[PDB]
Amino acid sequence: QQFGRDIADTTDAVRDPQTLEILDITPCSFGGVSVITPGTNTSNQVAVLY
């Protein structure tokens, strides 16, 4: 075998064609950014949540 799949039918493991080694695949850190504010009337400081 040479490929690697899962239930979702998405490639997640690749065999090295040179040294015959089984690698791994993972998406690199996607997400959403949100801010936290106590109300612009009281102050003007915020915090950031990733």
Partner: peptide
């Protein structure tokens, strides 16, 4: 665990991946 014997029995029966891909997130 801070559950009760009935709660413990319930939580051990609900048992039936999908980490992250194609913009699918679970809050």
């Amino acid at each position: 665990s801070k559950r009760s014997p009935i709660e413990d029995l319930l939580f051990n029966k609900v048992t039936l991946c999908a980490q992250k891909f194609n913009g699918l997130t679970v809050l």
